[PDB]
């Protein structure tokens, strides 16, 4: 089941409806792909067949 | 049989470093390879088993893998725990038992240079009344370790029965070398004086003392 | 769980040294043990395994008769004797337990030494077993040292003024001697204004010989 | 036969039918989906893993 | 007909004779015989008569 969403997740009881406080965080974290990164910190094009 | 490993691999903190471990055709390539680390003055523990997995209580930053007849281990984040050494344990058929690598030393990318302080100690009169004379001169608080002690009887470098040890890491990350050379007391008393000129990086400190001080 | 082992001391070449490892907590009928040594200046080396529930014993391809391995199931201890010790065997011997169970030769791919135990350093050399001898020394803040010679075996404990003097005390690592004995020095950093006004005492203790000798160090004029 | 010439792989553990006998059993629906993940994440892309 | 062999089974175009891990696999596999398991994984000693 795929899922797409952009609303801010709240980790506590603070109602965040457009802001990101101390317990409200953005739920979409991006990578960083540099050649400086080692072997186990590089993107692998994982494809799966079902 | 044994495996080839780099003697020293280093990396600055904030990024990752890689450690390689090659093998023969029937050492890694048919058998699993395991990674062991050990603290200085302690017992080793297990980090990677079955080439990918980790036991409970190990952080997720330690990752290793293999592709063909060789394996690599990559560690990310070097603050206080990655200064220990690592070993590449495997199994083969030629020796019919577990075989280990030579040893990889991991460091980080710093201390100021310390000038050597050599103190040539002549034998005391309490040694002369007991008919003994051990000429001793010790160098302490020097960095990095490049000392070389020369036994000079004021006209020639003479070496006989030299007992020279290695510098050791103290609690201040420094070095303190030592060197002894025992002599017959009349041979020591026949000398006009004595000197221990140690060459540490080129800053040779002359220390000549009289037998009667 | 804990896997404490019992070490030994220095001894003459060619005789037999017995090292023992004790197990507790877990059931000592399901897990193999492995015996690996660690010498300074080199890495780990593997010797062989036994089993607690059977009379299986396997050896390395280089140690076929130099080592024989012994099992004590009732005491829940395991023993090793080493026969005809060479010179290059001064190492730290580790009692290592691996999960699972293997007796066959082809079984050894899946074993890893999970729960290690603390090792002990055993040694080979040649010297007599007797107490230390303290050698007086004259100074060159004025630095003066205390010399102790021909102590056998390691270690020794150094104290100044029977523990009343601790500031400036700095011992030195043991050197190697060609005669088989060991040597050590203890140099203190004291002010030159109290070199002769306040006079210190050098003390050393050696618990294997059960002897204590004291002196009275004095700088020469 | 146009499968194994797409660079040397990293993980190909399979949880069912063998990849070489796929020609001998004829299917009706096969799914294809793909993404990119870090090298520390290839391990837990598996049936029943956290 | 018994068969004792430890040669590597290849499952790809590239030939394997001493290399394993990416598409070549070691043919033997060990049982995880534990008393923690239930009824369907216990080691049954089976003897046959012909
Ligand atoms: C993928 O496409 C590029 C685009 O031309 C091509 O050069 C490459 O050979 C293709 N990959 C394979 C495995 O054929």
Coordinates of C-alpha atoms and ligand atoms in Angstrom, one line a residue:
Chain A
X1 CA 0.0 0.0 0.0
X2 CA 1.5 3.3 -1.1
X3 CA 0.7 6.5 0.7
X4 CA 1.3 10.1 0.0
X5 CA 0.7 12.9 2.6
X6 CA 2.1 16.3 3.4
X7 CA 0.4 17.2 6.7
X8 CA 2.6 17.8 9.7
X9 CA 2.9 14.9 12.2
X10 CA 2.4 15.7 15.9
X11 CA 4.4 13.6 18.3
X12 CA 2.5 14.9 21.4
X13 CA -0.7 16.7 22.4
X14 CA 0.1 20.0 20.8
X15 CA -2.3 20.7 17.9
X16 CA -0.2 21.8 14.9
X17 CA -2.4 22.8 11.9
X18 CA 0.2 24.5 9.7
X19 CA 3.2 25.0 12.0
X20 CA 6.0 22.7 13.1
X21 CA 6.8 23.2 16.8
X22 CA 9.1 21.3 19.2
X23 CA 7.0 18.1 18.9
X24 CA 5.5 18.8 15.4
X25 CA 7.9 17.6 12.7
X26 CA 7.9 17.4 8.9
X27 CA 7.2 13.8 8.0
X28 CA 9.2 13.8 4.7
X29 CA 13.0 13.7 5.3
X30 CA 15.3 13.8 2.3
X31 CA 18.5 11.9 1.7
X32 CA 21.9 13.3 0.7
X33 CA 23.9 11.5 -1.9
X34 CA 27.6 12.6 -2.1
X35 CA 30.6 10.6 -3.3
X36 CA 32.1 11.5 0.1
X37 CA 29.6 9.0 1.6
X38 CA 30.9 5.5 2.1
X39 CA 29.7 2.2 0.7
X40 CA 26.8 1.8 3.1
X41 CA 25.4 5.3 2.6
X42 CA 24.7 5.3 -1.2
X43 CA 21.5 4.9 -3.2
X44 CA 20.7 1.5 -4.5
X45 CA 17.9 1.3 -7.1
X46 CA 15.9 -1.4 -5.2
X47 CA 13.3 -2.9 -7.6
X48 CA 11.0 -5.7 -6.5
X49 CA 8.8 -7.9 -8.7
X50 CA 5.6 -9.5 -7.3
Chain B
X1 CA 45.2 -19.0 4.7
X2 CA 45.7 -15.6 6.3
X3 CA 44.0 -12.4 4.9
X4 CA 45.6 -9.2 3.8
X5 CA 44.6 -6.1 5.7
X6 CA 45.8 -2.5 5.8
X7 CA 47.9 -1.8 8.9
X8 CA 46.3 1.7 9.4
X9 CA 43.3 3.4 8.0
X10 CA 42.1 6.8 9.2
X11 CA 39.3 9.3 8.6
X12 CA 38.2 12.6 9.9
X13 CA 35.0 12.7 11.9
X14 CA 31.7 13.7 10.3
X15 CA 31.9 11.2 7.4
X16 CA 32.7 7.5 6.9
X17 CA 35.8 5.4 6.3
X18 CA 36.1 1.9 4.6
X19 CA 38.1 -1.1 5.7
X20 CA 39.0 -3.8 3.1
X21 CA 39.6 -7.5 3.7
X22 CA 40.6 -9.7 0.7
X23 CA 40.7 -13.4 0.7
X24 CA 41.6 -16.5 -1.4
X25 CA 39.2 -18.6 -3.4
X26 CA 38.2 -21.0 -0.6
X27 CA 38.6 -18.5 2.4
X28 CA 35.9 -15.9 1.6
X29 CA 33.7 -16.7 -1.4
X30 CA 32.5 -20.1 -0.1
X31 CA 32.4 -19.3 3.6
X32 CA 30.9 -16.5 5.7
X33 CA 33.2 -13.7 7.1
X34 CA 32.7 -12.1 10.5
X35 CA 34.0 -8.8 11.9
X36 CA 35.4 -8.5 15.4
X37 CA 36.5 -5.4 17.3
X38 CA 38.3 -5.3 20.7
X39 CA 38.8 -2.5 23.2
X40 CA 42.4 -1.9 24.4
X41 CA 42.9 -4.1 27.5
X42 CA 39.6 -5.9 27.2
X43 CA 37.8 -8.8 25.4
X44 CA 36.5 -8.7 21.8
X45 CA 32.8 -8.6 20.9
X46 CA 30.7 -9.4 17.9
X47 CA 29.7 -6.7 15.3
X48 CA 28.7 -8.4 12.0
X49 CA 27.5 -12.0 11.6
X50 CA 26.4 -13.6 8.4
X51 CA 28.0 -10.7 6.5
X52 CA 24.9 -8.4 6.9
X53 CA 23.2 -8.7 10.3
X54 CA 24.0 -7.3 13.7
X55 CA 23.3 -8.4 17.2
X56 CA 21.1 -6.5 19.6
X57 CA 22.8 -3.6 21.3
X58 CA 24.9 -2.4 18.3
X59 CA 24.0 0.9 16.6
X60 CA 22.9 0.9 13.0
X61 CA 25.9 2.9 11.7
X62 CA 28.1 -0.2 11.4
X63 CA 27.6 -1.8 8.0
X64 CA 29.6 -4.3 6.0
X65 CA 29.1 -6.4 2.9
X66 CA 30.9 -8.5 0.3
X67 CA 30.6 -8.9 -3.5
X68 CA 33.1 -11.5 -4.7
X69 CA 36.2 -12.9 -2.9
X70 CA 36.6 -9.8 -0.7
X71 CA 34.6 -8.0 1.9
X72 CA 34.5 -4.4 3.1
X73 CA 33.3 -2.7 6.3
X74 CA 32.2 0.9 6.6
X75 CA 31.7 2.9 9.8
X76 CA 30.1 6.3 10.0
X77 CA 30.7 8.6 13.0
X78 CA 34.1 8.5 14.7
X79 CA 34.0 10.2 18.1
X80 CA 35.2 7.8 20.8
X81 CA 34.4 4.2 19.8
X82 CA 36.0 3.7 16.4
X83 CA 39.6 4.2 17.6
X84 CA 39.7 0.5 18.5
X85 CA 41.1 -2.1 16.2
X86 CA 39.2 -4.5 13.9
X87 CA 39.7 -8.1 12.8
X88 CA 38.4 -10.0 9.8
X89 CA 37.4 -13.4 11.0
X90 CA 36.5 -16.1 8.5
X91 CA 36.9 -19.9 7.9
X92 CA 38.6 -21.9 5.2
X93 CA 39.6 -25.5 4.4
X94 CA 43.4 -25.4 4.1
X95 CA 44.1 -24.8 7.8
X96 CA 40.8 -26.6 8.8
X97 CA 39.9 -23.9 11.3
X98 CA 39.2 -20.2 11.9
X99 CA 41.7 -17.8 10.4
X100 CA 42.1 -14.2 11.3
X101 CA 43.5 -11.1 9.7
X102 CA 46.7 -9.3 10.6
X103 CA 45.0 -6.3 12.3
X104 CA 43.6 -2.9 11.3
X105 CA 44.4 0.2 13.3
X106 CA 41.8 3.0 13.0
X107 CA 42.5 6.6 14.1
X108 CA 41.1 10.0 13.6
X109 CA 42.6 13.2 12.1
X110 CA 46.4 16.0 17.1
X111 CA 48.7 17.1 19.9
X112 CA 51.4 19.8 20.1
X113 CA 55.1 18.8 19.9
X114 CA 56.7 18.3 23.3
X115 CA 60.5 19.0 23.6
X116 CA 62.4 16.1 25.2
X117 CA 63.6 16.5 28.8
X118 CA 66.6 14.1 29.2
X119 CA 68.1 13.8 32.7
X120 CA 71.4 11.8 32.9
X121 CA 71.6 10.4 36.4
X122 CA 75.1 9.5 37.6
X123 CA 75.4 6.6 40.1
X124 CA 75.3 7.7 43.7
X125 CA 78.0 7.1 46.3
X126 CA 75.8 4.5 47.9
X127 CA 76.2 2.5 44.7
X128 CA 80.0 3.0 44.8
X129 CA 80.3 1.7 48.4
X130 CA 78.5 -1.4 47.3
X131 CA 80.7 -1.8 44.2
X132 CA 78.2 -1.2 41.5
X133 CA 77.5 1.5 38.8
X134 CA 74.5 1.5 36.5
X135 CA 74.5 4.4 34.1
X136 CA 70.9 5.5 33.6
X137 CA 69.4 8.4 31.6
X138 CA 65.7 8.7 30.8
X139 CA 63.6 10.9 28.5
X140 CA 60.1 11.9 29.4
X141 CA 57.4 14.3 28.1
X142 CA 58.2 14.0 24.4
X143 CA 55.9 13.8 21.3
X144 CA 55.9 12.3 18.8
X145 CA 58.1 9.3 19.6
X146 CA 61.3 9.6 17.6
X147 CA 64.0 9.4 20.4
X148 CA 67.3 7.7 19.9
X149 CA 69.7 7.4 22.8
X150 CA 73.5 7.2 22.2
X151 CA 75.9 5.9 24.8
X152 CA 78.9 8.3 24.5
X153 CA 82.0 8.0 26.6
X154 CA 82.9 11.6 25.6
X155 CA 85.0 10.5 22.6
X156 CA 83.1 7.5 20.9
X157 CA 79.7 5.9 20.7
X158 CA 80.2 2.6 22.6
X159 CA 77.3 0.1 23.0
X160 CA 77.5 -3.0 25.2
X161 CA 74.6 -4.7 27.0
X162 CA 72.1 -2.1 25.9
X163 CA 68.6 -2.5 27.4
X164 CA 66.3 -0.1 25.6
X165 CA 62.5 -0.3 25.9
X166 CA 59.7 1.3 23.9
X167 CA 57.7 4.5 24.8
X168 CA 54.3 3.9 26.4
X169 CA 51.2 6.0 26.3
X170 CA 50.5 7.6 29.6
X171 CA 47.2 9.2 30.8
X172 CA 48.1 12.5 29.1
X173 CA 48.6 10.8 25.7
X174 CA 52.4 11.3 26.0
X175 CA 55.5 9.1 25.9
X176 CA 58.2 8.3 28.4
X177 CA 61.1 6.1 27.1
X178 CA 63.8 4.5 29.1
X179 CA 67.2 2.9 28.5
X180 CA 69.7 1.3 30.9
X181 CA 73.3 0.1 30.5
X182 CA 75.1 -1.5 33.4
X183 CA 78.9 -1.3 33.8
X184 CA 81.7 -2.4 36.0
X185 CA 82.1 0.4 38.7
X186 CA 85.9 0.8 38.0
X187 CA 85.1 1.2 34.2
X188 CA 82.5 4.0 35.1
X189 CA 85.0 5.6 37.5
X190 CA 87.7 5.5 34.8
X191 CA 85.6 7.8 32.6
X192 CA 86.2 11.5 32.9
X193 CA 82.5 12.2 32.4
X194 CA 79.4 10.9 30.6
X195 CA 76.7 12.2 28.3
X196 CA 73.3 11.1 27.0
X197 CA 72.5 13.1 23.8
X198 CA 69.1 12.0 22.6
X199 CA 67.9 12.9 19.1
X200 CA 64.2 13.6 19.2
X201 CA 63.2 15.2 15.8
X202 CA 66.5 17.1 15.8
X203 CA 66.2 19.0 19.1
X204 CA 69.2 17.3 20.7
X205 CA 69.6 18.3 24.4
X206 CA 73.1 18.0 25.7
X207 CA 73.3 16.5 29.2
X208 CA 76.9 16.0 30.5
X209 CA 77.4 15.4 34.2
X210 CA 80.5 14.7 36.3
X211 CA 80.9 11.5 38.3
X212 CA 81.2 13.6 41.5
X213 CA 78.5 16.1 40.2
Chain C
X1 CA 27.2 -14.5 31.4
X2 CA 30.7 -14.5 33.0
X3 CA 33.4 -16.8 31.7
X4 CA 36.3 -16.1 34.0
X5 CA 39.6 -18.0 33.5
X6 CA 42.7 -18.6 35.6
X7 CA 46.1 -17.5 34.4
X8 CA 49.7 -18.4 35.2
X9 CA 53.1 -16.7 35.5
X10 CA 56.5 -16.9 33.9
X11 CA 58.2 -20.3 33.6
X12 CA 61.1 -22.2 32.0
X13 CA 60.8 -23.4 28.3
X14 CA 59.8 -27.0 27.5
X15 CA 57.7 -27.7 30.6
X16 CA 53.9 -27.8 30.9
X17 CA 51.5 -24.9 31.9
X18 CA 47.9 -25.6 32.8
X19 CA 45.2 -22.9 32.1
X20 CA 41.6 -23.3 33.2
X21 CA 38.3 -21.7 32.2
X22 CA 35.2 -21.8 34.3
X23 CA 31.6 -21.5 33.1
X24 CA 28.4 -20.6 35.0
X25 CA 24.8 -19.6 34.4
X26 CA 24.2 -21.3 31.1
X27 CA 23.8 -25.0 30.5
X28 CA 27.3 -26.4 29.8
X29 CA 26.0 -29.3 27.7
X30 CA 24.9 -27.3 24.6
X31 CA 27.7 -24.9 23.6
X32 CA 31.1 -25.6 22.2
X33 CA 34.2 -23.6 23.5
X34 CA 37.1 -22.3 21.4
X35 CA 40.6 -21.5 22.5
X36 CA 42.4 -18.5 20.8
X37 CA 45.6 -16.8 21.8
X38 CA 46.6 -13.1 21.4
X39 CA 50.2 -12.1 21.5
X40 CA 51.5 -8.5 21.5
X41 CA 52.5 -7.2 18.1
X42 CA 50.2 -9.6 16.2
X43 CA 46.5 -10.6 15.9
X44 CA 44.4 -13.5 17.0
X45 CA 45.3 -17.1 16.3
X46 CA 43.0 -20.1 16.6
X47 CA 44.0 -23.5 18.1
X48 CA 41.0 -25.9 18.5
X49 CA 37.7 -26.8 20.1
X50 CA 36.3 -29.4 22.4
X51 CA 32.8 -30.3 23.5
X52 CA 31.4 -30.4 27.0
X53 CA 28.9 -33.2 26.3
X54 CA 31.3 -35.5 24.3
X55 CA 34.9 -36.5 23.9
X56 CA 35.4 -34.6 20.6
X57 CA 38.7 -32.7 20.2
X58 CA 40.1 -30.9 17.2
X59 CA 43.5 -29.3 16.6
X60 CA 45.0 -26.6 14.4
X61 CA 47.1 -27.7 11.4
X62 CA 50.3 -26.3 13.1
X63 CA 49.7 -27.6 16.7
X64 CA 49.2 -31.3 16.4
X65 CA 51.1 -32.6 19.5
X66 CA 52.2 -29.4 21.2
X67 CA 48.7 -29.0 22.8
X68 CA 46.3 -31.5 24.3
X69 CA 42.9 -30.5 25.6
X70 CA 41.0 -31.8 28.6
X71 CA 37.4 -31.7 29.7
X72 CA 35.9 -31.7 33.2
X73 CA 32.2 -32.0 33.0
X74 CA 31.4 -32.5 36.7
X75 CA 33.4 -29.5 37.8
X76 CA 32.0 -27.4 34.9
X77 CA 35.6 -26.4 34.0
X78 CA 37.8 -26.8 30.9
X79 CA 41.6 -27.3 31.0
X80 CA 44.4 -26.9 28.5
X81 CA 48.0 -28.0 29.0
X82 CA 50.7 -26.7 26.6
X83 CA 53.7 -29.0 26.1
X84 CA 57.1 -27.8 25.0
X85 CA 56.6 -24.0 25.1
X86 CA 58.7 -22.1 22.5
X87 CA 60.0 -18.5 22.9
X88 CA 57.4 -16.8 20.7
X89 CA 54.3 -17.8 22.6
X90 CA 54.1 -15.0 25.2
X91 CA 50.4 -14.3 24.6
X92 CA 47.0 -13.7 26.2
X93 CA 44.9 -16.9 26.0
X94 CA 41.1 -16.4 25.7
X95 CA 38.3 -18.7 26.6
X96 CA 35.6 -18.1 24.0
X97 CA 32.1 -19.6 23.8
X98 CA 30.3 -19.9 20.4
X99 CA 26.6 -20.3 20.0
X100 CA 25.2 -23.5 18.5
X101 CA 27.1 -26.8 18.3
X102 CA 29.4 -28.4 15.8
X103 CA 31.5 -31.5 15.8
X104 CA 31.9 -32.1 12.1
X105 CA 34.6 -30.4 10.0
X106 CA 32.2 -28.8 7.6
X107 CA 30.0 -27.4 10.4
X108 CA 32.3 -24.6 11.3
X109 CA 31.0 -22.0 8.8
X110 CA 28.1 -20.8 11.0
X111 CA 30.0 -20.5 14.3
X112 CA 31.0 -17.1 15.7
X113 CA 32.6 -16.5 19.1
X114 CA 29.7 -14.8 20.9
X115 CA 30.5 -14.5 24.6
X116 CA 34.2 -14.0 25.1
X117 CA 36.0 -14.1 28.5
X118 CA 38.8 -12.1 29.9
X119 CA 42.2 -13.4 29.0
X120 CA 45.4 -13.7 31.0
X121 CA 49.0 -13.2 29.9
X122 CA 51.4 -16.2 30.3
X123 CA 55.1 -15.9 29.5
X124 CA 58.3 -17.6 28.5
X125 CA 61.7 -16.4 29.7
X126 CA 64.6 -17.5 31.9
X127 CA 65.4 -16.3 35.4
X128 CA 65.4 -17.2 39.1
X129 CA 62.4 -16.5 41.3
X130 CA 63.5 -14.1 44.1
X131 CA 62.8 -10.7 45.5
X132 CA 63.7 -7.2 44.1
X133 CA 67.0 -5.4 44.7
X134 CA 66.9 -1.6 45.0
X135 CA 69.7 0.4 43.4
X136 CA 70.5 3.9 44.8
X137 CA 70.6 6.9 42.4
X138 CA 71.9 10.5 42.6
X139 CA 70.2 13.5 41.0
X140 CA 71.7 15.1 37.9
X141 CA 63.0 21.6 40.4
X142 CA 65.6 18.9 40.8
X143 CA 64.8 15.4 39.5
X144 CA 65.9 12.2 41.4
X145 CA 65.0 8.6 40.7
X146 CA 64.9 5.2 42.5
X147 CA 66.2 2.2 40.7
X148 CA 64.9 -1.4 41.3
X149 CA 66.7 -4.3 39.6
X150 CA 66.6 -8.1 39.2
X151 CA 63.0 -8.5 40.4
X152 CA 61.3 -11.8 39.3
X153 CA 58.5 -12.0 38.3
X154 CA 56.1 -9.2 37.4
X155 CA 54.7 -7.0 38.8
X156 CA 56.0 -4.7 41.6
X157 CA 54.2 -1.9 43.5
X158 CA 56.0 1.4 44.1
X159 CA 55.3 3.7 47.0
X160 CA 57.1 6.8 48.4
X161 CA 57.3 7.5 52.2
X162 CA 55.1 4.4 52.7
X163 CA 52.4 6.1 50.7
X164 CA 52.7 9.6 52.3
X165 CA 54.4 11.0 49.2
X166 CA 52.2 10.7 46.0
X167 CA 52.8 14.0 44.2
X168 CA 55.3 13.8 41.4
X169 CA 55.5 10.0 41.5
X170 CA 56.1 8.6 38.0
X171 CA 57.1 4.9 37.5
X172 CA 58.5 3.6 34.3
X173 CA 57.7 0.5 32.2
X174 CA 59.8 -2.6 32.5
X175 CA 62.7 -3.0 30.1
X176 CA 64.0 -6.2 28.6
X177 CA 67.3 -7.7 29.9
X178 CA 69.5 -10.3 28.2
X179 CA 70.1 -12.0 31.5
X180 CA 66.5 -13.0 32.1
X181 CA 65.7 -10.6 34.9
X182 CA 63.6 -7.4 34.7
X183 CA 64.3 -3.8 35.6
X184 CA 62.3 -0.7 36.6
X185 CA 62.8 2.9 37.7
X186 CA 60.7 5.4 39.7
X187 CA 61.7 9.1 39.1
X188 CA 59.9 11.8 41.1
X189 CA 59.7 15.5 40.3
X190 CA 60.4 17.5 43.4
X191 CA 61.5 21.1 43.9
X192 CA 65.2 21.8 44.1
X193 CA 64.7 23.8 47.3
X194 CA 63.6 20.6 49.1
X195 CA 66.2 18.2 47.6
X196 CA 68.1 17.9 50.9
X197 CA 66.0 19.8 53.4
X198 CA 63.0 17.4 53.1
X199 CA 64.3 13.9 52.4
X200 CA 62.0 11.3 50.8
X201 CA 61.9 7.5 51.2
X202 CA 61.7 5.0 48.3
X203 CA 59.8 1.8 48.9
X204 CA 58.8 -1.2 46.7
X205 CA 56.8 -4.4 47.3
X206 CA 56.8 -7.7 45.5
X207 CA 54.0 -10.0 46.5
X208 CA 55.1 -13.2 44.8
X209 CA 58.4 -13.2 46.8
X210 CA 56.6 -11.9 50.0
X211 CA 59.5 -9.6 50.8
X212 CA 59.8 -5.9 51.5
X213 CA 63.0 -3.8 51.5
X214 CA 63.3 -0.1 52.4
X215 CA 66.1 2.4 51.9
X216 CA 66.9 6.0 52.5
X217 CA 67.8 8.0 49.3
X218 CA 70.2 10.9 49.7
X219 CA 71.6 13.2 47.0
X220 CA 75.3 13.5 46.8
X221 CA 77.1 16.8 47.2
Chain D
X1 CA 17.8 -13.7 -20.4
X2 CA 17.8 -9.9 -20.5
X3 CA 17.8 -9.8 -16.7
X4 CA 21.4 -10.6 -15.6
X5 CA 23.2 -7.9 -17.7
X6 CA 22.1 -4.9 -15.6
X7 CA 25.3 -4.4 -13.5
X8 CA 26.6 -6.7 -10.7
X9 CA 23.9 -7.0 -8.1
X10 CA 24.0 -6.6 -4.3
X11 CA 21.1 -8.6 -3.0
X12 CA 19.0 -11.2 -4.9
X13 CA 17.7 -13.5 -2.1
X14 CA 14.4 -14.9 -3.2
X15 CA 11.4 -16.1 -1.1
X16 CA 9.6 -18.5 -3.3
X17 CA 10.0 -19.9 -6.8
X18 CA 13.5 -20.2 -8.3
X19 CA 14.6 -17.4 -10.7
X20 CA 15.9 -19.9 -13.3
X21 CA 12.7 -22.0 -13.5
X22 CA 10.5 -18.9 -14.2
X23 CA 10.3 -19.9 -17.9
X24 CA 8.8 -23.3 -17.0
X25 CA 5.7 -22.0 -15.2
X26 CA 3.6 -19.5 -17.1
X27 CA 2.0 -16.6 -15.1
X28 CA -1.0 -14.3 -15.6
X29 CA -0.1 -11.1 -13.6
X30 CA 3.3 -9.9 -12.5
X31 CA 3.8 -6.6 -10.7
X32 CA 6.7 -4.2 -11.2
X33 CA 7.5 -1.3 -8.8
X34 CA 10.7 0.4 -7.9
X35 CA 12.3 3.0 -5.7
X36 CA 15.8 4.1 -4.3
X37 CA 16.9 3.5 -0.7
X38 CA 20.2 3.8 1.1
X39 CA 22.7 1.0 1.4
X40 CA 21.8 0.6 5.1
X41 CA 18.2 -0.2 4.2
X42 CA 18.4 -3.0 1.6
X43 CA 18.4 -5.6 4.3
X44 CA 15.0 -5.0 5.8
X45 CA 13.2 -5.0 2.4
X46 CA 12.1 -8.5 3.1
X47 CA 9.0 -10.5 4.1
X48 CA 8.5 -9.9 7.8
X49 CA 11.3 -7.6 8.8
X50 CA 11.5 -4.4 11.0
Chain E
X1 CA 21.4 -42.6 -4.4
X2 CA 23.3 -40.4 -1.9
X3 CA 25.2 -37.3 -3.0
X4 CA 28.0 -35.7 -1.0
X5 CA 29.2 -32.5 -2.6
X6 CA 29.9 -28.9 -1.6
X7 CA 30.3 -27.4 -5.1
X8 CA 28.6 -24.0 -5.7
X9 CA 25.2 -24.0 -7.5
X10 CA 25.0 -21.2 -10.1
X11 CA 21.7 -19.5 -10.9
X12 CA 22.8 -17.0 -13.5
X13 CA 24.6 -16.4 -16.7
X14 CA 28.0 -15.7 -15.0
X15 CA 29.9 -19.0 -14.1
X16 CA 30.6 -19.7 -10.5
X17 CA 33.3 -22.1 -9.4
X18 CA 34.6 -20.5 -6.2
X19 CA 32.5 -17.3 -5.9
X20 CA 29.2 -17.0 -4.1
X21 CA 26.9 -14.3 -2.8
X22 CA 25.3 -12.4 -5.6
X23 CA 23.7 -15.3 -7.6
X24 CA 25.6 -18.4 -6.5
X25 CA 24.7 -20.2 -3.3
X26 CA 26.3 -22.8 -1.1
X27 CA 24.1 -25.9 -1.5
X28 CA 24.0 -27.1 2.1
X29 CA 21.8 -25.5 4.7
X30 CA 21.7 -26.1 8.5
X31 CA 18.6 -26.8 10.6
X32 CA 18.1 -24.4 13.5
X33 CA 17.2 -27.2 15.9
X34 CA 16.0 -25.7 19.2
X35 CA 13.6 -26.9 21.9
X36 CA 11.9 -23.6 21.8
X37 CA 10.1 -24.5 18.6
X38 CA 6.7 -26.2 18.5
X39 CA 5.7 -29.5 16.8
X40 CA 6.6 -28.8 13.2
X41 CA 10.3 -28.1 13.5
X42 CA 11.5 -30.8 16.0
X43 CA 14.3 -33.1 14.9
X44 CA 12.8 -36.5 14.1
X45 CA 15.2 -39.4 13.8
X46 CA 13.9 -41.3 10.8
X47 CA 15.1 -44.9 10.1
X48 CA 13.9 -46.7 7.0
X49 CA 13.8 -50.4 6.0
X50 CA 14.0 -51.6 2.4
Ligands
LIG1 C1 20.3 1.9 -20.2 O1 20.0 3.0 -21.1 C2 21.2 3.7 -21.5 C3 20.8 4.8 -22.4 O2 21.3 4.7 -23.7 C4 22.1 2.7 -22.2 O3 23.3 3.4 -22.6 C5 22.5 1.5 -21.3 O4 23.2 0.6 -22.0 C6 21.2 0.9 -20.8 N1 21.5 -0.2 -19.9 C7 21.6 -1.5 -20.3 C8 22.0 -2.5 -19.2 O5 21.5 -1.8 -21.4

